Design a protein around this ligand. Sequence first.
Ligand code: NAG
Ligand code: NAG
Ligand code: NAG
Lengths: 55, 55, 55
Amino acid sequence: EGVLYVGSKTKEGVVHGVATVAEKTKEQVTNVGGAVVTGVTAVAQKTVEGAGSIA
Amino acid sequence: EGVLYVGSKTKEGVVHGVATVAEKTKEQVTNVGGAVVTGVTAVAQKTVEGAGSIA
Amino acid sequence: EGVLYVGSKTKEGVVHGVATVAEKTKEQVTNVGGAVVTGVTAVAQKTVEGAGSIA
Ligand SMILES: *[C@@H]1O[C@H](CO)[C@@H](O)[C@H](O)[C@H]1NC(C)=O
Ligand SMILES: *[C@@H]1O[C@H](CO)[C@@H](O)[C@H](O)[C@H]1NC(C)=O
Ligand SMILES: *[C@@H]1O[C@H](CO)[C@@H](O)[C@H](O)[C@H]1NC(C)=O
């Protein structure tokens, strides 16, 4: 029964620019956070928890 | 029954610029945090917890 | 039943610039923290906990 609460108050501007390039690469895993982020945030990329892939 | 609470108060500006390049590379795992981030944040990239991949 | 609490108060500006380059490399694992980060933060990259990958 866990409760939550989030609150944010910004007044001036927030510029936020991202760029990602990949040329002739075999793999590129990227995770960029936000400019003003308040609260829980979970990211999972190319993970394997149980009974993975077989070949 | 764990509860949570997050709060943030910014007034001036937040510039935030990211860039990621990859040329003819076999692997690139990247994780960049945010400019003003308050609260929990979990990231997992190319991890293996149990029963992984087989070849 | 562990509870949490986070709070932040910034007034002036927060410039935050990141850059990552990789040219003809076989591996690049990177993790950059945020400019003003308050709170828990967990990162895991290319880790192996149990029953890993086989070849
Ligand atoms: C198994 O799964 C992972 C990601 O979960 C993937 O990268 C890999 O190519 C897979 N391997 C096989 C043998 O299926
Ligand atoms: C197993 O999984 C990992 C990531 O979880 C992946 O990098 C790797 O290519 C996989 N290996 C095999 C033999 O499937
Ligand atoms: C096993 O997993 C790790 C990452 O978890 C990966 O780097 C590696 O390529 C894998 N090795 C085999 C033999 O699958």
